[PDB]
Amino acid sequence: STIEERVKKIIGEQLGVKQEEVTNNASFVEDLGADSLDTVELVMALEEEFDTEIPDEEAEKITTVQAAIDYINGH
């Protein structure tokens, strides 16, 4: 159960997407239809799953699946 798969599971659960269908390049807002509420939930869920704290400055950058994978991995 790798980082990628875990991140994708959270995105899929949060936005309602089946996670086999979630693409690494997917944009939360543009592609997935996330609004500002969804993105808050999304970031909170990542912190939970990975037991970390993401400062507002990193959070603001995490706009795609890949960005989430990247941040989470290097920590």
Binding site: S36, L37, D38, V40, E41, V43, M44, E47
Partner: protein, 255 residues
């Protein structure tokens, strides 16, 4: 029955009523501080938290049920939906209330003509998702409450913990609470409240548009208002020290 907890050393009594979807545990961020200046009375609203004997209620029935084991006299502080319950009691039993305090609350939650509030179709959409995907909805509601603030995420976490603290309320209770918010309109009757009346708001609160504050200042010239500049729907979570400071000052005006 109704769950009540009394704590604290203070000479003045203070009843705390929580908002929709939550319970008395939401107060734990400030209750130690408040308990040093007041004798606190914390309540789970009928149907919510550990107050299980109940289904959907009218505002009137909710308030009466709560009143049953309330203290003889107290300042009544109601947050959001609790604010309506506090207001209802101040109106019908003014002798039990030394002062009325509402926090992030409106006398009429739904928008009307020239009256800012929650748009009826928004509320109906919500009541719907609730019936549908209940959590994702309760959980989005918690994020909604803290959005736009410097401490958005930890405050949402603190609210989530309250929710987790106890089993969730039945859907008919949740529903009934939305019915209250949808329909109640205390704007005119509250013109007549004679006890000290303090209204607190979050500048960033989407659920109670700040715009109502000047309108209420006018409609209730005898009332007083304070806005927390950087708070949303839960200013006591985001600004505990400022919030407690204001209540302590209120205490002194009640003598």
């Amino acid at each position: 029955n109704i769950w009540w907890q009394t704590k604290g050393q203070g000479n003045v009594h203070l009843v705390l009523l929580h908002g929709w979807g939550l319970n008395a545990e939401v107060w734990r961020c400030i209750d130690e501080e408040l308990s040093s200046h007041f004798t606190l009375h914390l309540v789970d609203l009928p149907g919510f938290g550990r107050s299980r004997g109940f289904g959907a209620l009218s505002l009137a029935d909710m308030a009466e049920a709560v009143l049953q084991q309330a203290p003889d006299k107290a300042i009544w502080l109601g947050w959001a939906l609790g604010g309506l319950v506090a207001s209802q009691i101040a109106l019908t039993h003014p002798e039990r209330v030394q002062a009325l305090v509402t926090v992030a609350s409106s006398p009429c939650f739904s928008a009307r003509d020239e009256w800012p509030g929650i748009k009826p179709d928004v509320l109906a959409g919500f009541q719907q998702q609730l019936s549908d995907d209940f959590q994702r909805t309760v959980e989005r509601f918690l994020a909604l409450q803290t959005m736009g603030t410097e401490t958005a995420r930890q405050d949402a976490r603190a609210l989530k913990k309250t929710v987790l603290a106890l089993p969730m309320p039945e859907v008919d209770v949740l529903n009934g609470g939305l019915e209250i918010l949808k329909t109640v309109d205390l704007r005119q009757p509250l013109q007549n409240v004679s006890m000290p009346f303090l209204r607190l708001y979050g500048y960033l609160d989407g659920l109670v548009p700040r715009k109502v504050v000047p309108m209420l200042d006018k409609l209730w010239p005898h009332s007083e208002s304070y806005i927390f500049a950087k708070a949303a729907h839960a200013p006591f979570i985001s600004h505990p020290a400022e919030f407690c400071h204001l209540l302590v000052a209120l205490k002194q005006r009640v003598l």
